[PDB]
Enzyme design. Structure first.
Site, PDB file in Angstrom:
ATOM      1  N   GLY A  28       0.422  -1.519  -0.068  1.00  0.00           N
ATOM      2  CA  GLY A  28       0.344  -0.159  -0.065  1.00  0.00           C
ATOM      3  C   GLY A  28       0.769   1.248   0.226  1.00  0.00           C
ATOM      4  O   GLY A  28       1.993   1.311  -0.243  1.00  0.00           O
ATOM      5  N   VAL A  30       1.082   5.312   1.453  1.00  0.00           N
ATOM      6  CA  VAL A  30       0.148   6.374   2.927  1.00  0.00           C
ATOM      7  C   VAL A  30       0.622   8.255   2.093  1.00  0.00           C
ATOM      8  O   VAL A  30       0.957   8.086   1.557  1.00  0.00           O
ATOM      9  CB  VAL A  30       1.797   6.740   3.843  1.00  0.00           C
ATOM     10  CG1 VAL A  30       0.640   7.557   5.285  1.00  0.00           C
ATOM     11  CG2 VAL A  30       1.698   5.097   4.908  1.00  0.00           C
ATOM     12  N   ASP A 140       9.733  -5.220  13.946  1.00  0.00           N
ATOM     13  CA  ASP A 140      10.252  -4.551  13.290  1.00  0.00           C
ATOM     14  C   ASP A 140      10.118  -2.903  14.153  1.00  0.00           C
ATOM     15  O   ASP A 140      10.514  -1.861  13.023  1.00  0.00           O
ATOM     16  CB  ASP A 140       9.638  -4.592  12.617  1.00  0.00           C
ATOM     17  CG  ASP A 140      10.554  -4.079  10.428  1.00  0.00           C
ATOM     18  OD1 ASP A 140      11.007  -4.121  11.194  1.00  0.00           O
ATOM     19  OD2 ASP A 140       9.534  -4.337   9.775  1.00  0.00           O
TER      20      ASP A 140
HETATM   21  C1  LIG Z   1       5.549  12.484   6.979  1.00  0.00           C
HETATM   22  C2  LIG Z   1       5.110  11.791   8.076  1.00  0.00           C
HETATM   23  C3  LIG Z   1       6.266  11.422   8.717  1.00  0.00           C
HETATM   24  N1  LIG Z   1       4.073  11.302   8.325  1.00  0.00           N
HETATM   25  C4  LIG Z   1       3.410  10.489   9.049  1.00  0.00           C
HETATM   26  C5  LIG Z   1       3.797   8.822   8.392  1.00  0.00           C
HETATM   27  C6  LIG Z   1       3.093   8.111   8.596  1.00  0.00           C
HETATM   28  C7  LIG Z   1       3.422   6.537   8.362  1.00  0.00           C
HETATM   29  C8  LIG Z   1       4.824   6.281   8.637  1.00  0.00           C
HETATM   30  N2  LIG Z   1       4.944   5.114   8.141  1.00  0.00           N
HETATM   31  C9  LIG Z   1       3.620   4.402   8.397  1.00  0.00           C
HETATM   32  C10 LIG Z   1       3.166   2.994   7.381  1.00  0.00           C
HETATM   33  O1  LIG Z   1       2.394   2.802   8.227  1.00  0.00           O
HETATM   34  N3  LIG Z   1       3.752   2.350   6.830  1.00  0.00           N
HETATM   35  C11 LIG Z   1       3.710   1.444   6.307  1.00  0.00           C
HETATM   36  C12 LIG Z   1       5.252   0.550   6.249  1.00  0.00           C
HETATM   37  O2  LIG Z   1       6.138   0.620   7.057  1.00  0.00           O
HETATM   38  C13 LIG Z   1       3.139   0.753   5.892  1.00  0.00           C
HETATM   39  C14 LIG Z   1       2.850   2.379   4.595  1.00  0.00           C
HETATM   40  C15 LIG Z   1       1.999   1.042   3.614  1.00  0.00           C
HETATM   41  C16 LIG Z   1       1.792   0.026   3.422  1.00  0.00           C
HETATM   42  C17 LIG Z   1       2.181  -0.531   4.385  1.00  0.00           C
HETATM   43 CL1  LIG Z   1       1.464  -2.797   3.918  1.00  0.00          CL
HETATM   44  C18 LIG Z   1       2.777  -0.113   5.002  1.00  0.00           C
HETATM   45  C19 LIG Z   1       2.875   5.747   8.582  1.00  0.00           C
HETATM   46  C20 LIG Z   1       2.020   8.825  10.131  1.00  0.00           C
HETATM   47 CL2  LIG Z   1       0.753   7.372  10.640  1.00  0.00          CL
HETATM   48  C21 LIG Z   1       1.571   9.752   9.598  1.00  0.00           C
HETATM   49  N4  LIG Z   1       2.012  10.948   9.200  1.00  0.00           N
END
Ligand SMILES: CC(C)Nc1cc(-c2c[nH]c(C(=O)N[C@H](CO)c3cccc(Cl)c3)c2)c(Cl)cn1
Length: 340
Positions: A28, A30, A140
């Site tokens: 996915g 973000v 992780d």
């Molecule tokens: C500007 C950024 C720092 N702001 C931000 C980032 C996040 C966030 C940074 N990382 C993830 C996350 O969940 N990433 C994982 C990969 O580590 C992922 C993403 C898509 C698909 C899969 Cl399967 C896995 C969320 C949030 Cl929640 C709020 N603000």
């Protein structure tokens, strides 16, 4: 029609508008978005796991964990968007608090003062205390899974590899394949551990602390067994006692086959670091996982004395105990966020 970004349907309106790309993952993407109900910008994580059993399992575990947890140092779920029916549901979107940066980005560009390192480490461990109190392992922990706002408050994200702790089933053979990020893997992963004990997370925190001290990963291995080369290159050869704890002959005999390596003193690697920080580092980066410091002992360590307050380091109220059936459970688990 639905909003798109990086040629990819981002189907989150009308509540969520004005989208910009943030990052991505294995199944996915973000984005940031404007929440028209709360009048704030938010993060939205699109997840498309339904073709793979493994991704379904990780999606379900992450949603279930984050919905149960409530902690200042742990990212929350504010909303979940998906189509009204299973068949119309190709994707799940998880709405979370938008953060300014992550520790990976920050370490690429910024010297951390010792006060910043201290405070970041305190918050990591405070979040981890809660996680481990719920019988959960993150599995992780790394800089890119540590989020920061403009005032340096820290939140642990990405519970996609998290599991309920299972220390009585932790043992395996030498060179057993492992899923979590290589540089932050504890030595026992490569030797005889499935990564089902809380000590796996402490190791990763130790690597994160080291990386905050120098802005460079401490054990940047290029492949599965090279990871262990790097670890032993700094820790030195394991002790007789620590070798005797590894009953598996392949793992033991591998270690016995290596020439003697001397410990590199922490104050040689990190000559400007606080000596209390290096004493805690040593304790988190202990070879023998049974002797490795636990989260609540780390919090109580002299380095963190300015912040330590166990009455303000909460624990979990309710600890935790094919692919088609996994999909129905994600549909069920996200039902509470829909209209109606
Ligand atoms: C500007 C950024 C720092 N702001 C931000 C980032 C996040 C966030 C940074 N990382 C993830 C996350 O969940 N990433 C994982 C990969 O580590 C992922 C993403 C898509 C698909 C899969 Cl399967 C896995 C969320 C949030 Cl929640 C709020 N603000």
């Amino acid at each position: 029609g639905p909003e798109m970004v990086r040629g990819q349907v981002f189907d989150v309106g009308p509540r969520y508008t004005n989208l910009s790309y943030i990052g991505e993952g294995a199944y996915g993407m973000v984005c940031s978005a404007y929440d028209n109900v709360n009048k704030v910008r938010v993060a939205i994580k699109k997840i498309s796991p339904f073709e793979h059993q493994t991704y379904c399992q990780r999606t379900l575990r992450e949603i279930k964990i984050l919905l149960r947890f409530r902690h200042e140092n742990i990212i929350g779920i504010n909303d979940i968007i998906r189509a009204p029916t299973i068949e119309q549901m190709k994707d799940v979107y998880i709405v979370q608090d938008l953060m300014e940066t992550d520790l990976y980005k920050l370490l690429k560009t910024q010297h951390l003062s010792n006060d910043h390192i201290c405070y970041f480490l305190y918050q990591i461990l405070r979040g981890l205390k809660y996680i481990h109190s719920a019988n959960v392992l993150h599995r992780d922990l790394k800089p890119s899974n540590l989020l920061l706002n403009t005032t340096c408050d820290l939140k642990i994200c990405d519970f996609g590899l998290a599991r309920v702790a299972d220390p009585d089933h932790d043992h395996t053979g030498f060179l057993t394949e492992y899923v979590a990020t290589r540089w932050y893997r504890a030595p026992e992963i490569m030797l005889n551990s499935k990564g089902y004990t809380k000590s796996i997370d402490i190791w990763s925190v130790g690597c994160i602390l080291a990386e905050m001290l120098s802005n460079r990963p401490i054990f940047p291995g290029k492949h599965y067994l090279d990871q262990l080369n790097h670890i032993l290159g700094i820790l030195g050869s394991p002790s007789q006692e620590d070798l005797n704890c590894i009953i598996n002959l392949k793992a033991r005999n591998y270690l016995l086959s290596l020439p003697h390596k001397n410990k590199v003193p922490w104050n040689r690697l990190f000559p400007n670091a606080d000596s209390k920080a290096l004493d805690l580092l040593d304790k988190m980066l202990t070879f023998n996982p049974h002797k490795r410091i636990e989260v609540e002992q780390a919090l109580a360590h002299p380095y963190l004395e300015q912040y330590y307050d166990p009455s303000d380091e909460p624990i979990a109220e309710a600890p935790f105990k094919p692919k088609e059936k996994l999909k129905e459970l994600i549909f069920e688990e996200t039902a509470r966020f829909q209209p109606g």
